[PDB]
Each structure stands twice: as structure tokens, then as C-alpha cells.
Homo-oligomer: A and B are copies of this chain.
Amino acid sequence: IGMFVDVTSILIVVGGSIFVVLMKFTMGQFFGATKIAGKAFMFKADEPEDLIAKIVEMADAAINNTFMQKGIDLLVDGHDADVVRAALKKDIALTDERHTQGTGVFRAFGDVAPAMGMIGTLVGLVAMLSNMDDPKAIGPAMAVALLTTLYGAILSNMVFFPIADKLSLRRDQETLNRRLIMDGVLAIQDGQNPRVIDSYLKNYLNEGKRALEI
């Protein structure tokens, strides 16, 4: 309600954070980071088991994910093992780098929001004290300063840092799926049976964060 909303406080916090962030990230970089965050929040990463099932279902014959779309299209084009390896590792590194940079953008935002809140609360306290003949009606004058501090804390702890953490988790999942799809495409190019590759495909599915799931 109207006690928790202040135009000047949100303006100070948002403008200061945007200024400081644009001192290290261009507008295109920030927009790409927001696009990556929206993709990671509104879309679900493909299940590795479903990916393995799709790989083994399409292996014996010789389509939803774009990575395996590109893989099968380029294999149809008929390139070499060095070509497929180079292109797929390049795509993996590219995706990892943009995810890391989006994490950096949102972490810079989360680090700079509470400093802007401190600046805003200092401005509010100065404004309160400059008009204090008697300490009677200074409650609402302090409310705006604590409001700027609260805005900084909320944006830092409940918005920007969770977005960065979700981007990190999405980067991990995307890297795992990319490695799985690369291995499947290499196996299909070689022409092995579907059963032999599945023996080692899921050996390292318990890597890192998933180690607690067993």
C-alpha cells in the first residue's frame, strides 16, 4: 500500500544500479543477459533421460531440440569428425560463456543495489534531520529512508541473486545436456549399436550437484 511505495526511493535505487552496471556492461550485453534469464525462467531444460531415449530412437533409423537439429542437419551435409567436434565444442563454450556473463550481470546488479539503498537512506536521514525542530512527526520521515534500504535489500536478495543462481543452475544443466548430445551425435556418426553407447552415457550422470540425489 501507499506506505511501502515511494517514487524517489525506487528511482534512486534503480537509477544508481543501472548507472553503475552500465559502467561495466553495454546496453546490448544487458539486454542479452535479460533474454537469457527469461529463457532460463520460462523454459524447462530437456531431461537427460529423454535426450538419451531420443538419441537411441533416432540412431537406428539412420525432433525438438535445436542443438541436435543442427547436429543431424550438419551430419546430413556430410562433414568430418573434426568438423563436428570443433563446431559442437564451440557451441558448448559459447553457451557457457553467455550464461556466465549473464550471471555476472545479475550479480553486479545484486552487489550494487544495497549500496544504492544505503545512499538513499542517507539522503532520507539528511532530509529528515534538516527539518527537525522537534522529534514528533519524524516517523513518516524515517519511513522513506528505511524504504530505500528495504528496496535495496529486496532487490538484492529476492530478485537479482536468485536470477544469477538460476542462471548458474541452467548453465550446469545446459552443459550436461550439450555433452550428452555431442556424445550421442558422435556415436551416431560412427555407426555403433544403440546398446553399447548407453553403457557409458549414464555413467557420469551423477556428476556434481546431482551427487545428492542417489
Residues of A within 8 A of B (CB): 3-4, 16, 19-20, 23-26, 28-33, 36, 90, 94, 97-98, 101-102, 105, 112, 115-116, 118-119, 122-123, 125-127, 129-137, 139-140, 142-144, 146-147, 149-150, 153-154, 156-158, 161-162, 165-166, 168-169, 203, 206-214
Q: Which residues of B contact A33 (CB under 8 A)?
A: 212
Further 7 A-B residue pairs, CB within 8 A, beyond A3-B126, A3-B130, A115-B156:
A23-B165, A23-B169, A102-B212, A118-B153, A119-B157, A122-B149, A122-B153
Decide: A119 and B20 in contact? CB cutoff 8 A.
Answer: no
Contact of A212 with B29 in the complex, beta carbons under 8 Å: yes
Can you list 26 A-B contacts with CB-CB less than 8 angstroms, sorted by A residue number? A3-B126, A3-B131, A19-B158, A23-B162, A23-B169, A24-B169, A25-B212, A26-B212, A29-B209, A31-B212, A33-B212, A97-B208, A98-B211, A98-B212, A101-B211, A112-B157, A115-B156, A116-B157, A119-B150, A122-B149, A122-B150, A126-B150, A129-B143, A129-B146, A130-B144, A131-B140
